[PDB]
Symmetry: D3
Subunit: 287 residues, 6 copies
């Protein structure tokens, strides 16, 4: 009567990473190419392959149960809706470790920027007018907008705007168009959100199972099994944060699980205190 | 000291290449330097702006560019979205292109009955072109709900999001893939060349006029052909009828057609007893 | 079936060139990707996108009306069938100017070959055992076979056979595997064949229309409009071969005419040796 | 002085997975482009990159020593050969954990199938006529065949046959062409077979070394080092949930090696018994 | 014994050279990374070599003809004149391809009124000889920094005040904080011949090939033009197109006449617009595949 | 002021060098064809230069460290010693990548050994390394210096033989030649400009080197767990001279014991087979991501 409906961006780098995570969590399915409803083989789950821009909208209107989407698109649509008294409520279940990107202010290379107040009175081009307003209201700076749905980087050289606010990762497009990033106003990752309202306890249990699995996939990526050699224990313990007590062994030899990746800096700190520092990977876990 | 003529063309898409091709066939020289979105003409006082197609009517309507290449569908949808918010919406149409053809069509599920528009009365319809859909349904006097999606419209029926859809179509591939059939053409679009409203410096006026006359000539050369054939003298008046064109045939008949010869026309000519039908191309012309 | 059914190889260089020719002849259709029956929008025609290997078989069993296929696959299947008294009759409508390739005998680079008789008693690997037999029987030379359905070029170095008979265009694979082409046994192009038996006169008329159009597409590719500059006219006429040249008005000068073949440099040079202001214009479309 | 000759499919899914396994077993070699005989650098082994369809043929004619091939192609060729009294004997050394796929009967979507008997008298298209016959004889149902070398999915919509028997995984091709899978007739994996007859004891020892290593490569894929905390209550139950060879070692803490992959379901079972800090470490290489 | 022709093995210059030999009716197929290539239908061998070695090979008589950038030719001529090595050759024809330009570039945030602003600055280049030729001609002293590539590194790295590189996009310059400020050499590809005497057969062959290349160029440039003009305007139209043969004229009533003729250049729009202005009509331009005066 | 490192701009050698700096915790992103690259998290500049210029730059002190083929380093050292130019530098570490070999090749159709080259003309892009080789074999030859497409020379009648870089024989077979003699086997190397550093910059190079050592040691090393008879333990220890002292745990019973330890090399199958032969069982090898 009702399977769990999950909205994923149809095509994009964000799509593969979302499909990959559902599969790493033991959700089996095949995309029957260009068909946009995908039925899970082994679980009572439907995938809807939609434009990312529509996903907050769908989640907010209860029309799907779960949704994978950029924090940037989500917050922009929430604000566009709050501006029209449209329902804008949802529950955030988990932040992904992917889809990273940032909304940044950019100006022409040949231009001085001491801070946000240097934009007071200038026109700014953006595809994220709401997130730009939120930032400039917070900095108390007045500006004009120039709304373009893309090719934002055109606007300054084209005499359309004094500056822009765009998504950025590399800065290739910026250099190409005579611009430099000068201010991060929003840092986004993908996020997994849930429609508002009540859930059948079966469907509740399913989402809980899925989430616990996602937690495990992340914890295995991050965590590491560390073995080292003597008798300077408590300081070493502090230098390697983790959940459980380290087991201390025979000839001292310490075995334990880090919660974070071991960095070179940390390894170097340990030699400065320790010897035979090993880090083994962890394929799978559940605390 | 003066602002160059600024022309907006879609940055990336089918429509982009065909527009760049035509400016070059009209003797406008320019080279695209990668992801740079302002392009300066080498030999003419012209700038190109490589923007999203959806923003072009917007730009033209706000006078911020001079000329714009855009789908008749995007243009009419944005004119209506704007008239609904008392925003500018005025522009002048210079010329319809012989490219960018496509149609907005209503589609429903394959195994479902459609006698005519009235069968949609009260159904919810998903579309990226809410205004053009409204225009059509008001003309047919049928009431319906909308469901706005920014893309992947074809998802909506199978997903239980809407009873039907209104999408761009050519082949039907996406429709068949998603369990739908086109049942009703509501808008037929080609690309068009529009001009911002208001006054033009007579230099810039003269330039647009030169460009238009050249565009006419590049189209006339595509359409026109030099034809040479042998016929029975008796069949002359009939042959004349079969080949519409501007000038009289010379004497063996030599002449220039205004339309492309189809096979069917050539077969008609052999039937009149004409022989050695040649069609030579015309690279360039000006009546 | 009441629509004309045409078999085309599904995917391959041969596929594009076949679709292209049907479209140049005014047959409109869209491949709805991975769907293997394609219905024409504007003509009573179905396309079946099948393996090339099955097309002679389908044409011979009347199950399709027309078929585009390599002359090599066609003749091999005809012979495999004649060997099992299976129906192997069909009608060839036209040879294509595409799908060119050749079955060639290849041996190891460091090996001597004075002619076919140097293969007498040797084992030969091929995916075309029938065409190989036809060749060797014609040369009266006895040999063993080693049948492999591909990667034929492996056989000598692998000690499977003394030589091979493979399709060739470049010879990349041959050099890579230590071999040289030494003898062309079969030259193939694609060909358009028709099932045997009777046709409804409507369906007959349709195939005839299509063929006349294909003839015109080819004739326009080959032909050229030539204009040049009084004695030696009859000789010039001979040098440029299907109509009288119209004799120019402007003595010192003159000539306008249509060649049936491409003008080659050699021919142009011959003309200067006799002529001046030699022009060649293309012909987009024609019907003699 | 003849090296051990191993046949692997030249190009396909099955190729990479076979090359990968030879390398994981310490056979070094480099593919030099379109070259089809590949010599091992460090072992007395040649690889032959041939069409998969020819591999059972080669193994059965003793012309190669070992062969990697789909169980489906192998059984079809054994039967096609037994039907022509050609040599069809070989020895199966080991079944691979890759190349999974299944031959399935498919019919048109909007058509009823209660079971095999619904096919009695229908024509069926397939590239695997023998495996289809084997299945239908077992179910005692009579049918016609329509042999196609590929694009089988065309046949029903094209009016060439009532149903088909094709390889299937997702169903994409089937949906695209108006068909539904309704009956699995053969489940295949890749398999490693040996030519029949005697082996020199050196070459025997080498195949045995290779097999023992393959066993170890598989055992390392399957096996995992698991570390967890549990109540001493529910220990015997935990033992049952993690099958392996050795007893688990046990301050708190259980260390052991599983013989199977831990699934999420099993990990969830363990948390339910009240176990905590469940780790699974990979094993690159092993030998019991 | 055959005609030996050197062409750059791989590069934009390679395709355009192979294309031209084929358009001239020389048949051959490249079998991958095979570098000595025989023509099927003509007594001609192709050598696929590095562009930098081609002037060298032609100058040492080891090949007969060579396709190469004017820039690498002049750089090697000078490198050789500096070592009293043979630097003599004959130039047969300038190509209408292989365009590129050696330019001086300096840091964006720096003042440059002209070449004299380089006096005493260090300059990086892959073309040390052409750089010297330029600086001698402007009478300016400078230091060099020779690098075989990645020239654009030098200024940002504090290796050099300026650079002289091949320049095309501008992207690399902007990326590295530089601006082109001065063109020192504009190159096209050229076809050169080894020095010495030729067997008259081999002479005749090169002459045939050259005449064919002339024809391929003349067909690119030329157009068959058909128009209507007032008979009074004909002589004037003739004057406006010095690129023309004498037109064949036919009457149509007697006001206008129909003119058919071959231009030597393409008609620009501007010229076509000039013709409408004289009161000509129905100006058509047909392409020409192949031709020979 | 900051540490300047030269790496080949584009080539297989480039990726492997960038990869190693990142595996050593140096953060940076290449913004297209920008050639001076600043590290985000360390006082380190990267220069993306042509490989041929790297020895030159290191030798002229203009950069601090340089990643480069042993072959181009030795060729430029010799080109320079021939012009009394400074050719001094310090070698920090040999890489386990950038393998390739300069080989002599002649026409397929007689070569008994190097003396068969006496008096023949030879084409190469490495004229110095060719001279070094021929001097070492005491053989005289003519040269033909070309910057590339060396394999042309014999078929073209320019030269009797060639000396080229080789990996596959493809180009050789294509052009009617056979490799007959390896004259130089190269790997990439990490070299340092000559002179004094400043103890900050000294400390940094030392940190980087120790990290590179650790990345290599983790590639090579393995955590091995096995069962053996207690009697066989000392013998097993001997068989793995690559080992730490094993932690040994008794089972259940006292017959077999369980041994956990770290090899310095990977275990070959052959070694694992040797261990089963001593009557060890349940030989497991786990990977090691990182170590020190
Ligand atoms: N088959 C087709 N489907 C869609 N648009 C088509 C088609 N054929 C022509 N067009 C034309 O292309 C125009 C824009 O094409 P394009 O594919 O760039 O659109 P888009 O995907 O909406 O782009 P954008 O990134 O601006 O949203 C349409 O407005 C229409 O006029
Ligand atoms: N989804 C799949 N569909 C078909 N075969 C599969 C699939 N997955 C695995 N296989 C296996 O791969 C084997 C051969 O793979 P491949 O795709 O190269 O075959 P092929 O295209 O029939 O090859 P050939 O060129 O020899 O005709 C099959 O016989 C089967 O055992
Ligand atoms: O079915 P065809 O005639 O081949 O046309 C393909 C259709 O698919 C696209 O729209 P769609 O809304 O499906 O794409 P989206 O994922 O961008 O929303 C495109 O705009 C075409 O209309
Ligand atoms: O349906 P899926 O599980 O996605 O499997 C893909 C299908 O593609 C192949 O058939 P195809 O129609 O391509 O036949 P051909 O190889 O002869 O063209 C293969 O036999 C599979 O059945
Ligand atoms: Mg759009
Ligand atoms: Mg197969």
């Amino acid at each position: 009567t009702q399977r769990l409906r999950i909205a994923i961006q149809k095509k994009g780098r964000l799509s593969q990473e979302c499909q990959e995570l559902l599969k790493k969590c033991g959700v089996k399915f095949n995309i029957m190419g260009e068909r946009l409803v995908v039925h899970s083989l082994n679980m009572p789950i439907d995938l809807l392959l939609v434009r990312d821009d529509d996903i907050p909208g769908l989640i907010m209107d209860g029309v799907v149960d779960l949704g994978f989407v950029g924090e940037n698109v989500l917050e922009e649509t929430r604000l566009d809706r709050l501006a029209l008294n449209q329902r804008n409520e949802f529950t955030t279940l988990r932040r992904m470790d992917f889809g990273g990107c940032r909304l940044s202010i950019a100006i022409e290379k040949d231009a001085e920027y001491r801070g946000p107040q240097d934009l007071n009175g200038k026109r700014i081009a953006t595809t994220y007018p709401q997130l730009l307003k939120a930032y400039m209201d917070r900095q108390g700076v007045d500006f004009s907008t120039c709304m373009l749905t893309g090719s934002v980087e055109v606007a300054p050289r084209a005499g359309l705007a004094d500056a822009i606010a765009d998504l950025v990762s590399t800065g290739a497009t910026l250099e190409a168009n005579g611009l430099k990033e000068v201010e991060v106003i929003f840092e986004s990752k993908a996020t997994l959100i849930q429609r508002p309202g009540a859930f059948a306890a079966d469907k509740a249990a399913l989402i809980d199972k899925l989430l616990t699995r996602m937690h495990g996939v992340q914890q295995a990526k991050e965590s590491k099994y560390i073995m080292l050699h003597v008798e300077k224990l408590a300081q070493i313990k502090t230098l390697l944060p983790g959940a459980e007590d380290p087991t201390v062994l025979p000839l001292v030899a310490v075995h334990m699980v880090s919660s974070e990746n071991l960095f070179w800096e940390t390894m170097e700190q340990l030699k400065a205190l320790a010897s035979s520092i090993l880090v083994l990977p962890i394929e799978k876990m559940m605390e």
